[PDB]
Protein backbone atom coordinates (compact mmCIF):
# COMPACT_ATOMS: atom_id res chain seq x y z
CA UNK A 1 0.00 0.00 0.00
CA UNK A 2 1.19 3.50 -0.87
CA UNK A 3 1.51 6.06 1.92
CA UNK A 4 0.29 9.63 2.30
CA UNK A 5 2.33 12.68 3.25
CA UNK A 6 0.35 15.68 4.51
CA UNK A 7 2.33 18.67 5.75
CA UNK A 8 -0.55 20.39 7.55
CA UNK A 9 1.22 23.66 8.25
CA UNK A 10 -0.20 26.97 9.44
CA UNK A 11 -0.59 28.46 5.96
CA UNK A 12 -0.56 25.83 3.22
CA UNK A 13 -1.62 22.19 3.37
CA UNK A 14 0.75 20.18 1.14
CA UNK A 15 -0.52 16.64 0.66
CA UNK A 16 0.27 13.82 -1.75
CA UNK A 17 1.33 10.21 -2.09
CA UNK A 18 4.64 8.50 -1.33
CA UNK A 19 7.42 8.20 -3.89
CA UNK A 20 6.21 11.22 -5.88
CA UNK A 21 8.34 14.23 -6.80
CA UNK A 22 5.93 17.13 -6.20
CA UNK A 23 3.05 17.53 -3.71
CA UNK A 24 -0.16 17.06 -5.68
CA UNK A 25 -2.57 19.03 -3.45
CA UNK A 26 -1.03 22.33 -2.38
CA UNK A 27 -3.73 24.67 -1.10
CA UNK A 28 -4.00 27.21 1.74
CA UNK A 29 -5.64 26.18 5.00
CA UNK A 30 -8.63 28.50 5.50
CA UNK A 31 -12.29 28.06 6.43
CA UNK A 32 -14.52 30.71 4.87
CA UNK A 33 -17.97 31.60 6.17
CA UNK A 34 -20.36 34.20 4.70
CA UNK A 35 -20.95 37.43 6.59
CA UNK A 36 -23.63 39.13 4.46
CA UNK A 37 -27.33 38.43 3.90
CA UNK A 38 -28.12 36.05 1.05
CA UNK A 39 -31.19 37.14 -0.89
CA UNK A 40 -31.08 34.57 -3.72
CA UNK A 41 -32.63 31.15 -3.07
CA UNK A 42 -31.56 27.89 -4.71
CA UNK A 43 -28.48 26.78 -6.69
CA UNK A 44 -26.51 25.53 -3.68
CA UNK A 45 -25.43 28.24 -1.22
CA UNK A 46 -22.96 26.50 1.08
CA UNK A 47 -22.36 27.71 4.64
CA UNK A 48 -18.62 26.94 4.62
CA UNK A 49 -15.97 27.19 1.89
CA UNK A 50 -12.66 25.34 2.33
CA UNK A 51 -9.55 25.65 0.18
CA UNK A 52 -9.36 27.21 -3.28
CA UNK A 53 -13.12 27.90 -3.29
CA UNK A 54 -12.62 30.15 -0.26
CA UNK A 55 -9.79 31.87 -2.16
CA UNK A 56 -11.88 32.44 -5.30
CA UNK A 57 -15.00 33.60 -3.43
CA UNK A 58 -13.15 35.62 -0.75
CA UNK A 59 -14.98 38.90 -1.38
CA UNK A 60 -18.05 37.80 0.63
CA UNK A 61 -16.32 35.61 3.21
CA UNK A 62 -14.68 35.79 6.61
CA UNK A 63 -11.66 33.48 6.41
CA UNK A 64 -10.41 31.77 9.57
CA UNK A 65 -7.03 30.08 9.87
CA UNK A 66 -7.51 26.99 12.10
CA UNK A 67 -3.77 26.75 12.91
CA UNK A 68 -1.99 29.53 14.78
CA UNK A 69 1.77 29.18 15.40
CA UNK A 70 1.58 25.43 14.87
CA UNK A 71 -1.10 24.95 17.53
CA UNK A 72 -4.57 24.07 16.25
CA UNK A 73 -7.04 26.34 18.04
CA UNK A 74 -10.33 25.58 16.26
CA UNK A 75 -10.72 21.82 15.86
CA UNK A 76 -13.95 21.55 13.85
CA UNK A 77 -12.31 23.79 11.25
CA UNK A 78 -9.26 21.50 11.21
CA UNK A 79 -11.63 18.51 10.90
CA UNK A 80 -13.11 20.17 7.81
CA UNK A 81 -9.57 20.90 6.51
CA UNK A 82 -8.62 17.21 6.85
CA UNK A 83 -11.97 16.20 5.31
CA UNK A 84 -11.33 18.47 2.32
CA UNK A 85 -7.71 17.34 1.85
CA UNK A 86 -8.67 13.64 1.98
CA UNK A 87 -12.06 13.40 0.28
CA UNK A 88 -12.02 16.33 -2.16
CA UNK A 89 -8.37 17.03 -3.06
CA UNK A 90 -6.62 13.65 -3.18
CA UNK A 91 -9.96 11.76 -3.56
CA UNK A 92 -8.75 8.91 -1.35
CA UNK A 93 -10.05 6.73 1.45
CA UNK A 94 -8.01 7.31 4.65
CA UNK A 95 -9.16 3.90 6.00
CA UNK A 96 -6.82 2.08 3.57
CA UNK A 97 -3.84 4.46 3.50
CA UNK A 98 -1.08 5.25 6.02
CA UNK A 99 -0.44 8.91 6.75
CA UNK A 100 2.61 10.90 7.90
CA UNK A 101 1.77 14.24 9.52
CA UNK A 102 4.25 16.99 10.29
CA UNK A 103 4.64 18.86 13.56
CA UNK A 104 6.76 21.68 14.93
CA UNK A 105 8.88 20.93 18.02
CA UNK A 106 8.03 22.31 21.50
CA UNK A 107 4.28 22.01 20.74
CA UNK A 108 1.78 21.49 23.60
CA UNK A 109 1.12 17.81 24.19
CA UNK A 110 -2.70 17.99 24.19
CA UNK A 111 -2.49 19.28 20.61
CA UNK A 112 -0.72 16.01 19.69
CA UNK A 113 -3.31 14.11 21.79
CA UNK A 114 -6.16 15.64 19.81
CA UNK A 115 -4.37 15.06 16.46
CA UNK A 116 -3.99 11.37 17.39
CA UNK A 117 -7.59 11.01 18.65
CA UNK A 118 -9.33 12.83 15.76
CA UNK A 119 -7.01 11.19 13.20
CA UNK A 120 -7.70 7.72 14.67
CA UNK A 121 -11.45 8.13 15.37
CA UNK A 122 -12.88 10.36 12.61
CA UNK A 123 -10.56 9.50 9.70
CA UNK A 124 -9.53 6.12 11.19
CA UNK A 125 -6.38 4.79 9.50
CA UNK A 126 -4.48 1.51 9.53
CA UNK A 127 -1.42 3.53 10.60
CA UNK A 128 -0.28 7.11 11.12
CA UNK A 129 2.93 8.84 12.23
CA UNK A 130 3.76 12.32 13.53
CA UNK A 131 7.21 13.55 12.49
CA UNK A 132 9.42 16.59 13.01
CA UNK A 133 9.60 18.84 9.94
CA UNK A 134 13.35 19.55 10.19
CA UNK A 135 14.16 15.82 10.07
CA UNK A 136 12.13 15.57 6.85
CA UNK A 137 13.96 18.61 5.46
CA UNK A 138 17.26 16.84 6.17
CA UNK A 139 15.81 13.78 4.38
CA UNK A 140 15.10 16.03 1.38
CA UNK A 141 18.62 17.51 1.52
CA UNK A 142 20.11 14.03 1.05
CA UNK A 143 22.62 14.34 3.89
CA UNK A 144 22.83 12.87 7.37
CA UNK A 145 24.28 15.81 9.33
CA UNK A 146 23.32 19.47 9.36
CA UNK A 147 21.40 22.17 11.16
CA UNK A 148 17.92 22.76 9.74
CA UNK A 149 16.15 26.11 9.94
CA UNK A 150 12.52 25.53 9.01
CA UNK A 151 10.22 28.54 8.64
CA UNK A 152 6.64 27.90 7.59
CA UNK A 153 3.77 30.32 8.12
CA UNK A 154 3.65 30.16 11.92
CA UNK A 155 6.81 28.54 13.30
CA UNK A 156 10.52 29.12 12.67
CA UNK A 157 12.39 26.29 14.39
CA UNK A 158 16.05 25.26 14.44
CA UNK A 159 17.07 21.61 14.90
CA UNK A 160 20.69 20.35 14.61
CA UNK A 161 21.43 16.70 13.75
CA UNK A 162 24.83 14.95 13.54
CA UNK A 163 25.20 11.38 12.14
CA UNK A 164 21.54 10.66 12.76
CA UNK A 165 21.44 12.15 16.27
CA UNK A 166 19.24 15.14 17.03
CA UNK A 167 20.21 17.13 20.11
CA UNK A 168 16.95 17.93 21.95
CA UNK A 169 18.41 20.59 24.27
CA UNK A 170 19.66 22.57 21.24
CA UNK A 171 16.26 22.70 19.49
CA UNK A 172 14.83 26.23 19.45
CA UNK A 173 11.37 27.53 18.57
CA UNK A 174 10.47 31.06 17.49
CA UNK A 175 6.84 32.00 16.79
CA UNK A 176 7.70 34.34 13.91
CA UNK A 177 7.13 33.43 10.26
CA UNK A 178 5.15 34.47 7.18
CA UNK A 179 1.84 35.24 8.90
CA UNK A 180 3.55 37.74 11.20
CA UNK A 181 5.37 39.10 8.13
CA UNK A 182 1.97 39.44 6.42
CA UNK A 183 0.49 41.25 9.44
CA UNK A 184 3.52 43.56 9.63
CA UNK A 185 3.17 44.26 5.90
CA UNK A 186 -0.51 45.11 6.52
CA UNK A 187 0.73 47.50 9.22
CA UNK A 188 3.36 49.17 7.00
CA UNK A 189 1.38 49.37 3.74
CA UNK A 190 -0.88 51.82 5.59
CA UNK A 191 2.03 54.31 5.47
CA UNK A 192 1.83 54.59 1.67
CA UNK A 193 -1.96 55.10 1.79
CA UNK A 194 -3.21 51.59 1.01
CA UNK A 195 -5.64 50.36 3.66
CA UNK A 196 -6.18 46.63 4.23
CA UNK A 197 -8.33 45.58 7.19
CA UNK A 198 -10.33 42.48 6.25
CA UNK A 199 -9.33 38.81 6.19
CA UNK A 200 -9.74 38.76 2.40
CA UNK A 201 -7.22 41.60 2.08
CA UNK A 202 -4.68 39.50 4.03
CA UNK A 203 -4.53 37.22 0.97
CA UNK A 204 -3.81 40.21 -1.29
CA UNK A 205 -1.05 41.43 1.06
CA UNK A 206 0.28 37.83 1.11
CA UNK A 207 0.30 37.81 -2.71
CA UNK A 208 2.19 41.15 -2.64
CA UNK A 209 4.71 39.62 -0.21
CA UNK A 210 5.11 36.46 -2.32
CA UNK A 211 5.48 38.33 -5.61
CA UNK A 212 7.55 41.44 -4.82
CA UNK A 213 9.43 41.14 -1.50
CA UNK A 214 13.10 40.16 -1.21
CA UNK A 215 15.70 39.86 1.55
CA UNK A 216 18.25 42.68 1.57
CA UNK A 217 21.94 41.81 1.71
CA UNK A 218 22.63 44.96 3.75
CA UNK A 219 19.66 46.67 5.38
CA UNK A 220 21.02 50.20 5.98
CA UNK A 221 22.49 50.55 2.48
CA UNK A 222 19.19 49.36 0.99
CA UNK A 223 17.26 51.92 3.09
CA UNK A 224 19.67 54.63 1.90
CA UNK A 225 19.30 53.48 -1.72
CA UNK A 226 15.48 53.42 -1.52
CA UNK A 227 15.45 56.82 0.21
CA UNK A 228 17.79 58.33 -2.40
CA UNK A 229 16.34 57.05 -5.69
CA UNK A 230 13.19 55.18 -6.72
CA UNK A 231 14.97 52.32 -8.49
CA UNK A 232 13.91 49.70 -5.93
CA UNK A 233 10.22 50.65 -6.24
CA UNK A 234 8.02 48.10 -7.99
CA UNK A 235 4.38 48.04 -9.07
CA UNK A 236 1.56 45.55 -8.57
CA UNK A 237 -2.02 45.31 -9.86
CA UNK A 238 -4.91 44.82 -7.43
CA UNK A 239 -8.09 42.88 -8.37
CA UNK A 240 -10.10 46.14 -8.45
CA UNK A 241 -7.76 47.53 -11.13
CA UNK A 242 -5.80 49.94 -8.93
CA UNK A 243 -2.03 49.91 -9.43
CA UNK A 244 0.15 50.20 -6.33
CA UNK A 245 3.88 50.93 -6.22
CA UNK A 246 5.94 50.02 -3.15
CA UNK A 247 9.50 50.85 -2.13
CA UNK A 248 11.33 49.95 1.08
CA UNK A 249 8.46 47.65 2.19
CA UNK A 250 9.86 45.07 -0.26
CA UNK A 251 12.78 44.58 2.13
CA UNK A 252 11.48 45.97 5.43
CA UNK A 253 8.93 43.14 5.58
CA UNK A 254 11.33 40.10 5.47
CA UNK A 255 13.77 41.94 7.80
CA UNK A 256 11.55 41.00 10.78
CA UNK A 257 13.06 37.48 10.57
CA UNK A 258 16.48 39.03 11.24
CA UNK A 259 15.10 41.78 13.53
CA UNK A 260 12.16 40.52 15.65
CA UNK A 261 11.92 43.85 17.54
CA UNK A 262 9.90 45.32 14.62
CA UNK A 263 6.77 43.54 15.88
CA UNK A 264 7.67 43.98 19.55
CA UNK A 265 9.28 40.60 20.24
CA UNK A 266 12.21 40.48 22.67
CA UNK A 267 13.88 37.44 21.07
CA UNK A 268 16.82 37.58 18.68
CA UNK A 269 16.88 36.87 14.96
CA UNK A 270 17.10 33.59 13.07
CA UNK A 271 20.88 33.98 12.59
CA UNK A 272 21.43 34.32 16.35
CA UNK A 273 19.04 31.39 16.86
CA UNK A 274 21.10 29.29 14.40
CA UNK A 275 24.40 30.33 16.03
CA UNK A 276 23.08 29.65 19.55
CA UNK A 277 21.67 26.30 18.39
CA UNK A 278 25.12 25.36 17.04
CA UNK A 279 26.89 26.67 20.18
CA UNK A 280 24.56 24.68 22.47
CA UNK A 281 25.78 21.44 20.87
CA UNK A 282 28.94 19.52 21.67
CA UNK A 283 32.09 21.01 20.22
CA UNK A 284 33.38 18.37 17.76
CA UNK A 285 30.28 18.42 15.55
CA UNK A 286 30.05 22.24 15.24
CA UNK A 287 32.27 22.40 12.12
CA UNK A 288 29.93 19.93 10.41
CA UNK A 289 27.01 22.19 11.32
CA UNK A 290 28.71 25.20 9.69
CA UNK A 291 29.00 23.63 6.23
CA UNK A 292 25.48 22.13 6.13
CA UNK A 293 23.02 24.92 6.96
CA UNK A 294 19.89 23.40 5.42
CA UNK A 295 17.00 25.79 4.76
CA UNK A 296 13.36 24.89 4.21
CA UNK A 297 9.87 26.35 4.29
CA UNK A 298 8.23 28.91 2.05
CA UNK A 299 9.44 31.84 4.16
CA UNK A 300 13.04 31.22 2.98
CA UNK A 301 11.97 31.54 -0.69
CA UNK A 302 12.91 35.22 -1.04
CA UNK A 303 15.76 35.61 -3.58
CA UNK A 304 18.21 37.32 -1.22
CA UNK A 305 18.16 35.23 1.93
CA UNK A 306 20.99 32.67 1.47
CA UNK A 307 23.76 35.25 0.94
CA UNK A 308 22.39 37.35 3.82
CA UNK A 309 22.28 34.46 6.30
CA UNK A 310 25.73 33.31 5.07
CA UNK A 311 26.99 36.86 5.79
CA UNK A 312 25.40 36.88 9.27
CA UNK A 313 26.68 33.42 10.29
CA UNK A 314 30.14 34.18 8.78
CA UNK A 315 30.17 37.31 10.96
CA UNK A 316 29.10 35.17 13.93
CA UNK A 317 31.24 32.03 13.40
CA UNK A 318 35.05 31.92 13.78
CA UNK A 319 36.73 32.92 10.53
CA UNK A 320 39.02 29.86 10.13
CA UNK A 321 36.18 27.62 8.93
CA UNK A 322 33.81 27.45 5.96
CA UNK A 323 30.14 28.46 6.03
CA UNK A 324 27.89 26.89 3.38
CA UNK A 325 24.12 27.38 3.15
CA UNK A 326 22.29 24.43 1.61
CA UNK A 327 19.41 26.20 -0.18
CA UNK A 328 17.77 23.90 -2.77
CA UNK A 329 15.62 25.39 -5.56
CA UNK A 330 12.64 23.33 -4.31
CA UNK A 331 12.89 24.25 -0.61
CA UNK A 332 9.18 25.19 -0.46
CA UNK A 333 8.05 21.55 -0.68
CA UNK A 334 11.09 19.89 0.95
CA UNK A 335 9.16 18.85 4.08
CA UNK A 336 6.75 16.95 1.81
CA UNK A 337 9.61 15.53 -0.29
CA UNK A 338 11.51 14.18 2.71
CA UNK A 339 8.23 12.82 4.01
CA UNK A 340 7.93 11.00 0.67
CA UNK A 341 11.39 9.39 1.01
CA UNK A 342 10.67 8.53 4.69
CA UNK A 343 7.26 7.08 3.80
CA UNK A 344 8.93 4.99 1.07
CA UNK A 345 11.78 3.82 3.34
CA UNK A 346 11.84 0.09 4.08
CA UNK A 347 13.08 0.51 7.67
CA UNK A 348 10.29 2.97 8.55
CA UNK A 349 7.58 0.25 8.31
CA UNK A 350 8.22 -0.94 11.88
CA UNK A 351 7.78 2.59 13.31
CA UNK A 352 4.12 3.04 12.36
CA UNK A 353 1.53 3.63 15.08
CA UNK A 354 -0.96 0.92 14.17
CA UNK A 355 -4.63 0.98 15.17
CA UNK A 356 -4.21 -2.04 17.47
CA UNK A 357 -1.44 -0.30 19.44
CA UNK A 358 -3.65 2.80 19.71
CA UNK A 359 -6.55 0.69 21.05
CA UNK A 360 -4.26 -1.00 23.58
CA UNK A 361 -2.42 2.11 24.78
CA UNK A 362 -5.10 4.80 24.53
CA UNK A 363 -4.08 8.16 23.07
CA UNK A 364 -0.79 8.02 25.01
CA UNK A 365 1.54 6.11 22.65
CA UNK A 366 2.24 9.28 20.61
CA UNK A 367 4.33 10.70 23.47
CA UNK A 368 6.47 7.55 23.61
CA UNK A 369 6.47 6.30 19.99
CA UNK A 370 7.13 9.64 18.28
CA UNK A 371 9.85 12.16 19.15
Amino acid sequence: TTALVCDNGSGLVKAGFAGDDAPRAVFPSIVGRPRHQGVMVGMGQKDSYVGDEAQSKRGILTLKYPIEHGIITNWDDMEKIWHHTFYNELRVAPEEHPTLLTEAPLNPKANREKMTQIMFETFNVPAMYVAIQAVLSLYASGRTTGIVLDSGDGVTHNVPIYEGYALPHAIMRLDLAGRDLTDYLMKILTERGYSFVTTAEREIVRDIKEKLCYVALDFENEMATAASSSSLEKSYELPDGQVITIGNERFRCPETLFQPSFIGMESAGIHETTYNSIMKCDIDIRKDLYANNVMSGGTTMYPGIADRMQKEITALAPSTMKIKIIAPPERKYSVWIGGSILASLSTFQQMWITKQEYDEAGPSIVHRKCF
Partner: protein, 84 residues
Protein backbone atom coordinates in the same frame (compact mmCIF):
# COMPACT_ATOMS: atom_id res chain seq x y z
CA UNK B 1 -24.82 -6.21 60.41
CA UNK B 2 -21.78 -6.87 58.17
CA UNK B 3 -23.56 -6.51 54.81
CA UNK B 4 -20.37 -5.36 53.05
CA UNK B 5 -18.42 -8.49 54.03
CA UNK B 6 -21.11 -10.97 52.84
CA UNK B 7 -19.61 -11.50 49.37
CA UNK B 8 -19.22 -14.85 47.58
CA UNK B 9 -15.70 -16.03 46.63
CA UNK B 10 -14.75 -15.71 42.94
CA UNK B 11 -14.21 -18.55 40.50
CA UNK B 12 -11.39 -16.87 38.55
CA UNK B 13 -8.17 -15.13 39.55
CA UNK B 14 -8.80 -11.39 39.94
CA UNK B 15 -6.56 -8.39 39.34
CA UNK B 16 -5.62 -7.02 42.74
CA UNK B 17 -6.81 -3.50 43.52
CA UNK B 18 -4.12 -2.22 45.88
CA UNK B 19 -5.15 0.00 48.78
CA UNK B 20 -4.19 1.06 52.31
CA UNK B 21 -6.49 -0.95 54.58
CA UNK B 22 -7.76 0.70 57.76
CA UNK B 23 -7.61 -1.01 61.15
CA UNK B 24 -10.95 -2.43 62.25
CA UNK B 25 -11.07 -0.73 65.67
CA UNK B 26 -10.40 2.68 64.08
CA UNK B 27 -13.27 2.00 61.65
CA UNK B 28 -15.71 1.27 64.52
CA UNK B 29 -15.75 4.82 65.91
CA UNK B 30 -18.97 6.56 66.95
CA UNK B 31 -18.82 9.35 64.33
CA UNK B 32 -17.48 6.94 61.67
CA UNK B 33 -18.93 6.78 58.16
CA UNK B 34 -18.38 3.00 58.15
CA UNK B 35 -20.36 2.78 61.40
CA UNK B 36 -23.26 4.51 59.62
CA UNK B 37 -22.85 2.04 56.76
CA UNK B 38 -22.87 -0.84 59.27
CA UNK B 39 -26.45 0.00 60.23
CA UNK B 40 -28.71 -2.28 58.12
CA UNK B 41 -31.25 0.48 57.38
CA UNK B 42 -28.77 2.35 55.17
CA UNK B 43 -29.07 2.25 51.38
CA UNK B 44 -27.05 -0.55 49.77
CA UNK B 45 -26.31 -1.09 46.07
CA UNK B 46 -26.04 -4.71 44.93
CA UNK B 47 -23.22 -4.98 42.36
CA UNK B 48 -23.45 -7.16 39.26
CA UNK B 49 -20.56 -9.52 40.01
CA UNK B 50 -21.06 -11.45 36.74
CA UNK B 51 -19.74 -8.67 34.49
CA UNK B 52 -16.89 -7.88 36.92
CA UNK B 53 -15.93 -11.57 36.91
CA UNK B 54 -16.31 -11.57 33.11
CA UNK B 55 -14.07 -8.62 32.27
CA UNK B 56 -11.59 -7.93 35.08
CA UNK B 57 -10.40 -11.51 35.63
CA UNK B 58 -6.94 -12.54 34.46
CA UNK B 59 -6.68 -13.94 30.91
CA UNK B 60 -5.55 -17.50 30.25
CA UNK B 61 -3.22 -19.05 27.70
CA UNK B 62 -10.75 -10.44 -6.06
CA UNK B 63 -10.45 -9.10 -9.64
CA UNK B 64 -13.03 -6.32 -9.93
CA UNK B 65 -10.78 -3.64 -11.49
CA UNK B 66 -7.67 -5.28 -12.95
CA UNK B 67 -4.82 -2.92 -13.82
CA UNK B 68 -1.35 -3.27 -15.32
CA UNK B 69 -0.06 -0.08 -13.66
CA UNK B 70 1.05 0.30 -10.07
CA UNK B 71 -1.30 1.98 -7.61
CA UNK B 72 0.58 5.31 -7.39
CA UNK B 73 0.45 6.08 -11.13
CA UNK B 74 -3.14 4.77 -11.31
CA UNK B 75 -4.36 7.09 -8.53
CA UNK B 76 -2.39 9.98 -10.07
CA UNK B 77 -4.22 9.17 -13.32
CA UNK B 78 -7.51 9.15 -11.38
CA UNK B 79 -6.75 12.64 -9.99
CA UNK B 80 -5.80 13.73 -13.53
CA UNK B 81 -8.92 12.19 -15.10
CA UNK B 82 -11.66 13.12 -12.62
CA UNK B 83 -10.99 16.88 -12.91
CA UNK B 84 -12.10 16.83 -16.57
Amino acid sequence: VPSHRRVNPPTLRMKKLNWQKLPSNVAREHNSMWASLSSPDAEAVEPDFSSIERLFSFPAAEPKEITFLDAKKSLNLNIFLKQF
